[PDB]
């Protein structure tokens, strides 16, 4: 029942592989549906073609700004922003998928994949999924980041959709 979407990653044009996530629609239905819908492109816009604008080794990989591509844009399938659904799920380890935000109740389209356990973010960022397969591709992406997050190469979401 919980959806499974995927992202085919490409660094400067060459495929790196497919990463798939399980979205916990059973605990954060509104947040999960936002991500599912952005992955299939059914509302007319979404992640296909977007890039990871902030990558920080040993922390996380951030993307989802399909409008400004700099972490200033993005929008949800509800409006530019939506409230923090709940904080039931915590940042337990690598692979956790969570919402990036500009403070409370500012969820849009930006997300981040954790490569470490980021407990200091619990209760501030809504966790809504986890990497199902492909964790090694995410670690490989870290090699293109920097202490501050600026990327070394153009890491994009070549394609995406729903598997289940």
């Amino acid at each position: 029942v919980n959806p499974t979407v995927f992202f085919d990653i490409a660094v400067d044009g060459e495929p790196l592989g497919r990463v798939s996530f399980e979205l916990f629609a059973d605990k954060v239905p509104k947040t999960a549906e936002n991500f599912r819908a952005l992955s299939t492109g059914e509302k007319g816009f979404g992640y296909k073609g977007s890039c990871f604008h902030r990558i920080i080794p040993g922390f996380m990989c951030q993307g989802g700004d399909f409008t400004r591509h700099n972490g200033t844009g993005g929008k949800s399938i509800y409006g530019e922003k939506f409230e923090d659904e709940n904080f039931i799920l915590k940042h337990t380890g690598p692979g956790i998928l969570s919402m990036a935000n500009a403070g409370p109740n500012t969820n849009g389209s930006q997300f981040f994949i954790c490569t470490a356990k980021t407990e200091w973010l619990d209760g501030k960022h809504v966790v809504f999924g986890k990497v199902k397969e492909g964790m090694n591709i995410v670690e490989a992406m870290e090699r293109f980041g920097s202490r501050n997050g600026k990327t070394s190469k153009k890491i994009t979401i070549a394609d995406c959709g729903q598997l289940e």
Binding site: R54, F59, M60, T106, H125, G149
Partner: peptide
């Protein structure tokens, strides 16, 4: 916010 962020994280940065």
């Amino acid at each position: 916010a962020x994280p940065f």
